[PDB]
Amino acid sequence: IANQPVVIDNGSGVIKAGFAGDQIPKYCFPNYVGRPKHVRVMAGALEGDIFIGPKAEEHRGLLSIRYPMEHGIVKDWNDMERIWQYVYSKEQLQTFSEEHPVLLTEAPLNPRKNRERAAEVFFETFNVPALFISMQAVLSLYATGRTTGVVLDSGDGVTHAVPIYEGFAMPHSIMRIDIAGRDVSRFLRLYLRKEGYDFHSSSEFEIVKAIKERACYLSINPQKDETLETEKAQYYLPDGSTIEIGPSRFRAPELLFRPDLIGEESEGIHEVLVFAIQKSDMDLRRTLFSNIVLSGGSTLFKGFGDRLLSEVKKLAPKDVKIRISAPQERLYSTWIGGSILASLDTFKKMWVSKKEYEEDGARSIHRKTF
Amino acid sequence: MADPKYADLPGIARNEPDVY
């Protein structure tokens, strides 16, 4: 049973879905379950009581949204089962889980219990013929067509940098933080309350993400932007009430570089990139500096790559060619590589079959991934 | 190509100049 396999690119922010051997994912929607706050007195209302995908995006105001995954670690397992069921259902894929093999994704250095419980869901509740779990960095390099590359990614949950060299992922050189797009959006919300405009509800939270996506930029020199007085640019809500953002637009993404702003001493994006290259072997460093690949949504800020270059120039050894590459399709880079990996004939050997899972259990899944 | 989010005029990469 070797049908056209499915590529479920997981993530706390957005969940991409579709079939193998495609250019772009057809089914992209945000990873959250929406349930109504209010009472439904009047008949002919929105049925189901559980809202996932474009219905939830359309009807935010009703729904008390709650994210099942935080930092690539599913907290609420019932909510992810409903989302994965919604992905497979007639509203998106229009196919059964029994037909196609599954390509799952996870962030590196995650809890092994979550990986086991993920496999349990796909093998038992859904009846998958074969499952395979993979990393974000390996898939990003598949999409570009390279083998050598440091993959500095920045999603909604996790930021990390896996240094791969000619098809050799070094597991001990991996640097990871739990500071990313969601924490920047949460940090922007806190600033907007200090400015004046308060947002508190979960439906109301996604307005702050939309402000962060649209009107934010990274200053090349933050001390210079502090000393100077900002212009105070405007933004229109779905309501229509105007919001003067002020200095919070440039100070919000500084959480990525200075994680001491949230009050949680970590490395930072630029330090993680340097530390990943430094932890690897001596002869591999110059090739890893030349091949720096970007991916994820929190790399899309204005002047992000310019500042990320300047920080590498400050930290790294002098007179070395730094090249921070970044494709046009950064958001779907991880899905594209999964679709390419799924289309290859070697894919049949790498996966974990249902029969192999029933015999061995979790140990066989831990062996095949690494 | 089709889909909601893209960035126009960032470029593929930012590279330092190669010396002799």
Partner: protein, 370 residues
């Protein structure tokens, strides 16, 4: 099969389920005569009800049982129900189920006492109490939209989105048609047309229905009234006497938009609706602005929809597209909604029963309502 009985504070409306308009329409009055020791000839009724009290108005003390949507005298309300079922409708309450209506944010004891009278005294097979705004929205056809309901009892607002009522965004208002009628009667006394007794209360009410209209701009209308006498219309009474008033046409229903005239210290109907919409979630304001539904007799003044469009646009941001749904049949919108609710097949499982009432008691209605 089912009967719909909109127990309004002014006009008590009633009829059958799945109908265009109600059969039984009359003012909810119980006129008791002048008790003097002198006798009365060839017999008479001790306490008149409905249209009989309106016909023989000159003598009878016209006391309304419902005051601000609150039943004060329950024996009086029991006589009006009896008059609705046996005399007007010509059908027993034991055979047919009975849909009732109360305004939102009413006393909790009133539903319990209303339901007790239906089951114990009248012996009804099944009953239900609905919100008036919910039925008014259901008569109009839309699932989404705020309803600025305004009768002689109580003005109130109930914002609803996609068949989900927002109970905490509801705003009941003490201003209503009866307070406007009393205000018109006072300003008539100021220009030498004194009406003290309750028989003249219905004449000034009838003057209010005919002549009065909502001003587009109040200060402009006051200036034109001083200059010209073309606006000064004449109304003849039941008696051959005829009277002429100039200022009092536009000035009477202005009390809705300026409660300071009556001495209430409350928000006007224009900004009460705005304040209701702002209390809702920020994402679902556009649809509430688009579907600003009106209902009841206090919204039957000419040019009220134009004044609501002027004031709501002035309060709200400039980007918003304001629109008032003002149908021709908005006077009887609450009853039409109840007739459509009774006609549906889903409503057959939503009734209260005799056996359920005997098990629980009056407190079961609060669960069934909303």
């Amino acid at each position: 099969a089912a009967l719909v009985v909109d127990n309004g504070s002014g006009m008590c409306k009633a009829g059958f389920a799945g109908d265009d308009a109600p059969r039984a329409v009359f003012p909810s009055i119980v006129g008791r005569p002048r008790h003097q020791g002198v006798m009365v000839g060839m017999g008479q009724k001790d306490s008149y009800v409905g249209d009989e009290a309106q016909s023989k108005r000159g003598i009878l003390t016209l006391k309304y049982p419902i005051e601000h949507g609150i039943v004060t005298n329950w024996d009086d309300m029991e006589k009006i129900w009896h008059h609705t079922f046996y005399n007007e409708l010509r059908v027993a309450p034991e055979e047919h189920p009975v849909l009732l209506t109360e305004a939102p944010l009413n006393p909790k004891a009133n539903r319990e006492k209303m339901t007790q009278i239906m089951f114990e005294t009248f012996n009804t097979p099944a009953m239900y109490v609905a919100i008036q705004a919910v039925l008014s929205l259901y008569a109009s056809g839309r699932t989404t939209g705020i309803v600025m309901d305004s009768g002689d009892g109580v003005t109130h607002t109930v914002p609803i989105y996609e068949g989900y009522a927002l109970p905490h965004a509801i705003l009941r208002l003490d201003l209503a048609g009866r307070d406007l009628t009393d205000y018109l009667m006072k300003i008539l006394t100021e220009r030498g047309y004194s009406f003290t007794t309750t028989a003249e209360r219905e004449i000034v009410r009838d003057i209010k229905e005919k002549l009065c209209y909502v001003a587009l701009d109040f200060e402009q209308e006051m200036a034109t009234a001083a200059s010209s006498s073309s606006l000064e219309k004449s109304y003849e009474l039941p008696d051959g006497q005829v009277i002429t008033i100039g200022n009092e046409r536009f000035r009477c229903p202005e009390a809705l938009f300026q409660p300071s005239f009556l001495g209430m210290e409350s928000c006007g109907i224009h900004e009460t609706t705005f304040n209701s919409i702002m209390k809702c979630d920020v994402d679902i304001r556009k649809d509430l602005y688009a579907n600003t539904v009106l209902s009841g007799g206090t919204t039957m003044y000419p040019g009220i929809a134009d004044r609501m469009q002027k004031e709501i646009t002035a309060l709200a941001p400039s980007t918003m597209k304001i629109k008032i749904i003002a149908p021709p049949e908005r006077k009887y919108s609450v009853w039409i909604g109840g007739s459509i609710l009774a006609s549906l097949s889903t409503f057959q499982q939503m009734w209260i029963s005799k056996q359920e009432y005997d098990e629980s008691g009056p407190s079961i209605v609060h669960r069934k309502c909303f």
